[PDB]
């Protein structure tokens, strides 16, 4: 059933999956770089609630971030770390670090870091789009409320450039069916089906291997024809804003496997697009 889109459509039902479909409760920090609005939404079993909002925020520069020093705020889907104290009053009372660069950023060769949500200089110095070095600044008098809303939660960061990016039920359902079809192909050492879920042109890796060599490597590995038992859990699927006019999603999950002497849980992440035929194509894989 898990390989059928309509099974997932039934599971999703009337849930609000516009900011993603999550196995458990999460918060989503949604920033739009054109609107200069940051909102925090809680997701509870498909019910969305707006818990925080500030308008007239300061972000970094427009455009897709590429390198250390370009001053741009990254567009995409990230995670937020716990409140911390920079120890420099320039950042306001405290800060929260986003995970820029993520795996997709890295395999695309992007550089930089230090993309945080923080406040304003305690001495009153003004901020502008050039001074945050890509960080997102909220007024200090709103940061206590922001901190309370994100405290002790699993918190994601969704940053749009201009267009409003929302997940669609049909896309989440089709991707979940593709995910479990890809899982079955790996389980059965079915090289051809497995490889059909990778973008022959755009899939990128740390080791810079091209698709032809990746295909032959996987066929070699799969030739062991090992009997495998694998379970996915804690699946989170999220829409992925981008400036390439692609329908992209992030899929994260735990990979579980029992061994006669150990049960292993490992974190998996796929960054994917939906191709013109409606099929998942993996662009980066942990």
Numbering used by the authors: 40 to 325
Can I see the authors' text?
The helical morphology of Campylobacter jejuni, a bacterium involved in host gut colonization and pathogenesis in humans, is determined by the structure of the peptidoglycan (PG) layer. Pgp2 is an LD-carboxypeptidase that cleaves D-Ala from both monomeric and cross-linked tetrapeptides. The structure of Pgp2 contains an N-terminal helix (residues Q43-I51), the catalytic LD-CPase domain (residues V65-K201), and the C-terminal NTF2 domain (residues K208-Q325), each connected to the next domain by a single loop. In summary, we show that helical shape in C. jejuni depends on both the LD-CPase and NTF2 domains of Pgp2.
A recombinant Pgp2 construct (Pgp243-325) containing residues 43–325 of the native sequence (cjj81176_0915) is enzymatically active and was suitable for structural characterization. The Pgp2 structure contains one Pgp2 molecule in the asymmetric unit. An extensive interface with a buried surface area of 1130 Å2 is found between the LD-CPase and NTF2 domains, as calculated by the PISA server. The likely catalytic triad (C174-H157-G158) is located on the central stands β5–β6. The NTF2 domain contains three helices (α6–α8) wrapped around a curved antiparallel β-sheet (β8–β11), which together forms a cone shape domain with a broad pocket. Regions of high sequence conservation are observed on one side of the molecule, focused in two clusters. The first cluster is in proximity to the catalytic triad in the LD-CPase domain. The second cluster is formed by 17 primarily aromatic (41%) and charged (30%) residues that are clustered in the pocket of the NTF2 domain. In the wild-type Pgp2 crystal structure, the average B-factor of β9-β10 (residues 292–310) was 53.4 Å2, 1.8-fold higher than the average B-factor over all residues. The conserved CPase active site and NTF2 domain pocket are ∼40 Å apart along the same side of the protein surface.
